[PDB]
Structure formats: structure tokens, C-alpha cells
Amino acid sequence: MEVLKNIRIYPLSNFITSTKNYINLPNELRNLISEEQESKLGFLHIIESDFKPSVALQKLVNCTTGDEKILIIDIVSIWSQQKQRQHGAIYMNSLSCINITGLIVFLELLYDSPMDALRRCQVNFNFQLRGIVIDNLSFLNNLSKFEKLFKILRKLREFLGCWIITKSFPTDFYNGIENTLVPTKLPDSYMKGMDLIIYREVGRPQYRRI
Amino acid sequence: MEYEDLELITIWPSPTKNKLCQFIKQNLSKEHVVTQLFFIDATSSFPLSQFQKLVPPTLPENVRIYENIRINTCLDLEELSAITVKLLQILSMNKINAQEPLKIILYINGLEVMFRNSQFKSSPQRSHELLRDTLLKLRVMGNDENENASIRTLLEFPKEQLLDYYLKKNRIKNGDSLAEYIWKYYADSLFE
């Protein structure tokens, strides 16, 4: 029978085993996604006005144990400052990676030959790459390049299993000095790629979902 | 402020001429390092008379200091970009020719003027992009782990251009001033 040949019986292991890493939301960002969803988080975007990373973002990154590492592409030259460096992180802070063209070239090399790419970050490869962080997307640039960026990050997740966290500034930034350029200005393709988009607005800091 | 305590980009609102002179004096007299000041300004407004009174060129301990101060008048963002190229050349060459420590203080006054001029000669988009590229470049330059040569950037602004800062202490405006925009999106700190 066709019925017999197509019967599929799965071991329970399949449902709790995974080749991918998932983002652990700090309690500052819980109660936004359901349980299952927060168990399947692979791409997270945060919009926040601060130049330096908010507390939530900092907690999203130091999720490091044992041999695990996070690659931080530090376009803003904040995370990799001498006094800010952490043991759980590898840093890309380079004049070859502060525009979207160089960024895309770097990530393409990371996918093709992670060794060659990570040598650019001064890295011993006795570590699992747990996630990649890019701060700050608002300094990049348009849609074709961002589609390309999203596609490469997605391939990186497929191949290496890392989660992806990115940050951008709110619309205020895009207004420009004295409004001469006139809740973030990223292409909807990129944004549609996200699993969870967080928006931090502030007297006090609230984190809403979009 | 001492060089080793400087952030990658620091805003200094309305420094008095005497305090600027004192800053230069104490930083460029430091021993066992070669400290240089590149003073980039839109007006040629280095307080030379005051500097000569507070740091007389006839005293021997000051000759070194005058040797290591560089003056440039810079009218727009394109020229600032070119100066940044020259500084990167100096730094890169120093690191290469080293493989004694060089410490560069880049001090820029009148950046809002340079921006305004630039965005009369081209689009607001172009000038924002040039400003962005220059400042992000300066941050990466200042952030280099290399010990043999380093740079730190100070931006002078009149305090009236930074009301958002003073308000946070604790008017209707038509967008951020350049100083406020940099304070929010490009500078590590602001020093009174």
C-alpha cells in the first residue's frame, strides 16, 4: 500500500534536538513573545535611541558560556573599545567593514571560509560561534544591498547555526541635522526577515514589540 | 583631561582660552611619548596671544611643545576628509616604520560651519554621508589596539548649540543642531 510506505514515525528526540542556536531573551524582554516563539528565536532586531547599547541589548549579548563566542561587528566602535571588551566575544572593527559593501564582503567570506574571516578578527578555533551582532545598521548606505545582507545572514544561520541580532536608531536619526533630510528606516524586506522586532522608547524605558 | 583618559570622540562645549591653553600645555609636555596637536578650525581662531602668555616660546621646556602643534584652516567637510586621510597616513606609516609612542590629539573647532558650507555646495544627503564616513573613520582610528601610535578626537562647540544636553538637567526646534546630532549619535562623551 502507499499508506504503509508513507507512514512516518518520529523519535521524540527530533522535537528537542537542533543544529541551531536560539536567542535567550532577558526578563526585560519576556512577556512579549509566547513560550514556543521565544524558543524559536533566530533573528532579532532592536530599535533604540541610545548610541551605547541599552541594558537589554548588553544582556542579549553576554549569553556566553564555556567555549561559546559571539561575533560583534562593531561598526560604531563601542563594543570593542579596550575597556568594554568581553571574553565571550570576537570583534570585527575595521575600516574595511564600516560600509555595507565591505560588510557584505566580510560576511560572504565568513560563510565561505570562516577561518579566513575570523583571522581578520585576531582569533584558536576551539569555540562554537553562537551568534552575530551588527551595531548599528543606521550607519549603512539601498534595498538591493540590504536584501543581500539579509540573505547572507540567513545563509550564515543555515550553515553555522548562529542567531543574528541587529540594532538601528529610531526615525529621529533619519530626520537629519536641522531636519534637512525630511519607527526606523530599514527596508521592509530586511524587517520582514526578523523573527522579533523590539522598540525601546523613553522618562522611563519601555520595550514594545512591533 | 589627560590623553590616556580621552574617549575616541569627546565634545568640549565653550572651553575658555586659558583652559584650552592649559590642556595643550599639560598634554604636550608629557614625557617618554611624542604628543602632537592638530588644531583644525573653520576660522583661524587658535588663541595664539593667550597661548604665548601661558606657554612662552622663549622658555626651553616649551620649544618641544611649539614643535608639535599643527595648525590648519578647514572650510568644509571635503577638506576635513582630506585631513583625516593625512592623519591616517601618518599613523599607518608610524605603525609600519615601528615594526617613541606617537599620541595625536585631533582638535576640531567649527565643524557646524564646515557642515553648513558643504551642504550649500552639495545635497544634505551628501554632507550627512561625508560627516558620517569621516566620524566613523576617526572612531575606528582611535580604537586601534596598536600601542605605537594613537589618535583621540575633540570637538569644540559653543554651548548654545548643545541645549538638549543642558536641558537634560533635570523651546521648539527645527531638528537637532550638528552638535546635538553628534552628541547623540557619534560622540562617546561630553566634558564640561
Side-chain angles (χ1 to χ4, degrees), chain A residues 69-82 84-85 88-118 120-121 123-127 129 131-135:
Chain A
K69 277 150 166 39
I70 300 192
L71 169 63
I72 303 178
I73 307 181
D74 183 24
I75 292 163
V76 296
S77 297
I78 294 177
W79 300 84
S80 64
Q81 299 196 17
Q82 235 56 275
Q84 296 303 328
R85 287 186 177 233
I90 286 168
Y91 299 93
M92 171 43 63
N93 182 246
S94 173
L95 292 178
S96 73
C97 204
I98 56 171
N99 63 45
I100 193 158
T101 297
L103 175 55
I104 287 174
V105 169
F106 172 69
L107 298 165
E108 287 174 322
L109 179 70
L110 183 65
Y111 182 84
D112 291 344
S113 180
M115 233 156 164
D116 290 312
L118 295 175
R120 299 183 176 182
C121 309
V123 328
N124 185 321
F125 299 77
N126 287 317
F127 65 89
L129 180 70
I132 300 174
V133 174
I134 312 182
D135 186 358

Side-chain angles (χ1 to χ4, degrees), chain B residues 56-65 67:
Chain B
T58 40
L59 297 170
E61 66 270 13
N62 293 333
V63 60
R64 176 170 175 240
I65 294 184
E67 278 183 71

Side-chain angles (χ1 to χ4, degrees), chain A residues 134-144 146 148-150 152-179:
Chain A
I134 312 182
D135 186 358
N136 185 312
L137 298 186
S138 300
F139 288 124
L140 298 177
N141 299 172
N142 303 241
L143 216 101
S144 190
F146 262 95
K148 187 165 180 183
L149 172 64
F150 170 74
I152 185 62
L153 293 168
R154 205 226 310 185
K155 283 171 64 194
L156 279 168
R157 177 163 178 74
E158 217 59 75
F159 174 44
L160 303 181
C162 47
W163 44 250
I164 311 299
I165 289 171
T166 55
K167 170 178 166 159
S168 64
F169 289 134
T171 316
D172 178 84
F173 171 80
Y174 297 92
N175 292 340
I177 297 170
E178 291 152 1
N179 288 328

